[PDB]
């Protein structure tokens, strides 16, 4: 596991079965499980909206916690 | 041989800085805006408007962006780079100032102790430390079936707490008339 | 307006129309801006050979044009057009209208409308031009007409007049040829504002008329 | 109430006394469903000429701009009742002006139903969504296959209110918004508005393809007025009814007083032969009795079509239109350059809205109508 890409985030590396060759580094498989899958669009349009919405109403939640504690005091 | 509080944020302070908002080379550029930070994500922006009175007026903002903020710094062009425990994210400001404090990430892990430098070469390149203890340098310019799962996970997280805060409202309207 | 169209459509006696006419004339400042013109259109269709004087009098009493404030311009314009059409496609409206502002003699509280309509009538049918001159000289000498009048007249309603600027000059010509300094001063202000607000051709005609006055006069 | 043992409750139920003497009030103040902290300490007497008043730093930031009005009103007010009433009115106007600080959606209403409505419309009409999920753009197709996009702005809770819709085509788009109206409801409304002016596009795309179209360069769908080149340094312009597009649009020529002259003379005696059933281009080719230079050189500079005063094409978008009534010159000019030149000239005599004078190149009579 590492950022073998140098894109910032970790990815995974997999090695398959030295029966292939008497040599390493063959039959690899790299992936993030996001868009990233290396080996040997309407769906990809709507994620940022969701990922905003979560933290948005999370901020709402925290604000209203503050609200709660306030009138309790 | 006096000291003056200005605003008094209410959470622990981490970062303070300045910007030349509306930056429209020279080392010392006359900073226009001011920025201050909290720990639990309370940010403060200050501007001079000199509007609505025919006199000099301060224009303030108090934003609340998510995540317990770990560290941040200012990028040239009125930008700010800040590290949550999830990801590194950015906020540009230069437009007077923005009403909502939106922010994208940049697909990089939870860093801390960010320090930005300007190229003016091309674009912006900077330095940082990973939370795991690794130094890095940055240079800057099926799935819908999983997406629906993501949507509904977030909806389920939020609606519970919305109901909880309505329970608070009920407690409160009641205790008030008591 | 629908009511009025329908009343034009149905089989009626006219004595009722008169009642309704008076009714709207009361309810005449108390109308919104837009329809106003068509109401007046109705009225001026509805009018006859004889009632004309009185209705106009009431009208001339009830129209203000300082009250109507893209806040009054388009509609005013359209109004004037309408009136313009009315007094084009019949004559006696004008003689009655003149009579009405002419016999408004005791009134030193003259309103904007009057001059504007005078210009207009001067621009249109011409047999009465000498009548108009005559009457306008007479109210001027009487001092009932004065200059802050003309000031606010050209400060607002000019747009109406641009397309009849030639009328103003043909008048001012007959104003300066007379005696009685106040008349001559009036004609001056005419030439002045005409050169002031209007366009190049106007300006040119101004200069060209003044020069004539100089050399010949 | 008239008395402030009940009116104080009715108007600031959130604002209540601590001290035995009703001198220390604390609590909250409501504003747009936001309860702001407040502590307010009167003197021994109920005089507001002194009235200590601290708040949240939230509130002091929001009232940066009115602390002088506070100093005024604390001392000028007759009663705490009217004081606080005016205060709340003030707070509302403050946030009304600072209304750029306001949005939060409810997920299970919003983030649930919205993708069901997207699947209802079609994921392939989906051209864009915003990282806020604030903006979303969608595609509609004319039956020819012209893409008409449209943008939509979504509130916290969308179907409760209209979204803000922004469309390209010229006529005022009306979207009959009920809460029963959804994305596909407004989409059908979008189509019905498209299908009203469909046959307009069928002539417009034809004109776009065929002839030397001039000056709605890259014409959008909004464009109802067009301009076409013909002959040489003579251009026509058109403006078409979207509702009766094959009906005769109102038109005129730009160019020479000897080239534009017999063009209108033919048009006058062949307009009666206008058969609106054909295409517009086809009707023209017989009405004018000519072929177009059908992009015959389009946008290739042979120095023919140039101002001769400013030596430029598209001077502020202004086209070389005014020409000489001369076989030997045929020098085309703009409006503004020719105007300013014949302005200073001594022989340049001015009628109503005409300037006469000599062509700059050939010194022959040339007429300019503004
Ligand atoms: Zn030019
Ligand atoms: Zn020439």
Curated annotation (Swiss-Prot), chain A:
Transmembrane segments: none annotated. It is found in: Nucleus. Coiled coil: none annotated. DNA repair protein required for FANCD2 ubiquitination. It is linked to Fanconi anemia complementation group B: A disorder affecting all bone marrow elements and resulting in anemia, leukopenia and thrombopenia. It is associated with cardiac, renal and limb malformations, dermal pigmentary changes, and a predisposition to the development of malignancies. At the cellular level it is associated with hypersensitivity to DNA-damaging agents, chromosomal instability (increased chromosome breakage) and defective DNA repair. Some severe FANCB cases manifest features of VACTERL syndrome with hydrocephalus. Belongs to the multisubunit FA complex composed of FANCA, FANCB, FANCC, FANCE, FANCF, FANCG, FANCL/PHF9 and FANCM. The complex is not found in FA patients. This is Fanconi anemia group B protein. It comes from Homo sapiens. The chain holds residues 330 to 417 of 859 of the full protein.
From Swiss-Prot, chain B:
It is found in: Nucleus. Belongs to the multisubunit FA complex composed of FANCA, FANCB, FANCC, FANCE, FANCF, FANCG, FANCL/PHF9, FANCM, FAAP24 and FAAP100. Forms a subcomplex with FANCB and FANCL. Signal peptide: none annotated. This is Fanconi anemia core complex-associated protein 100. Plays a role in Fanconi anemia-associated DNA damage response network. Regulates FANCD2 monoubiquitination and the stability of the FA core complex. Induces chromosomal instability as well as hypersensitivity to DNA cross-linking agents, when repressed. The gene is FAAP100. The lineage of its organism: Eukaryota, Metazoa, Chordata, Craniata, Vertebrata. The chain holds residues 260 to 485 of 881 of the full protein.
Swiss-Prot record, chain C:
Deubiquitinated by USP1 as cells enter G2/M, or once DNA repair is completed. Monoubiquitination requires the joint intervention of the FANC core complex, including FANCA, FANCB, FANCC, FANCE, FANCF, FANCG, and FANCM, and proteins involved in cell cycle checkpoints and DNA repair, including RPA1, ATR, CHEK1 and BRCA1, and is mediated by FANCL/PHF9. Monoubiquitination prevents DNA release from the FANCI-FANCD2 complex. Phosphorylated in response to various genotoxic stresses by ATM and/or ATR. In contrast, phosphorylation by ATR on other sites may be required for ubiquitination and foci formation. It comes from the Eukaryota. Residues 6-92 are annotated as: Interaction with BRCA2. It is found in: Nucleus. Highly expressed in germinal center cells of the spleen, tonsil, and reactive lymph nodes, and in the proliferating basal layer of squamous epithelium of tonsil, esophagus, oropharynx, larynx and cervix. Expressed in cytotrophoblastic cells of the placenta and exocrine cells of the pancreas (at protein level). Highly expressed in testis, where expression is restricted to maturing spermatocytes. Coiled coil: none annotated. The C-terminal 24 residues of isoform 2 are required for its function. Belongs to the Fanconi anemia protein FANCD2 family. This is Fanconi anemia group D2 protein. It comes from Homo sapiens (Human). The gene is FANCD2.
From Swiss-Prot, chain D:
This is E3 ubiquitin-protein ligase FANCL. Changing residue 252 to A: Impairs interaction with FANCI and FANCD2. Residues 104-294 are annotated as: UBC-RWD region (URD). CDD domains: DRWD-C_FANCL, DRWD-N_FANCL, ELF_FANCL, RING-CH-C4HC3_FANCL. InterPro entries: Fancl, FANCL_C, FANCL_d2, FANCL_d3, FANCL_d3_sf, FancL_WD-rpt_cont_dom, UBQ-conjugating_enzyme/RWD, Znf_RING/FYVE/PHD. It catalyses: S-ubiquitinyl-[E2 ubiquitin-conjugating enzyme]-L-cysteine + [acceptor protein]-L-lysine = [E2 ubiquitin-conjugating enzyme]-L-cysteine + N(6)-ubiquitinyl-[acceptor protein]-L-lysine. It comes from Homo sapiens (Human). Ubiquitin ligase protein that mediates monoubiquitination of FANCD2 in the presence of UBE2T, a key step in the DNA damage pathway. Also mediates monoubiquitination of FANCI. May stimulate the ubiquitin release from UBE2W. May be required for proper primordial germ cell proliferation in the embryonic stage, whereas it is probably not needed for spermatogonial proliferation after birth.
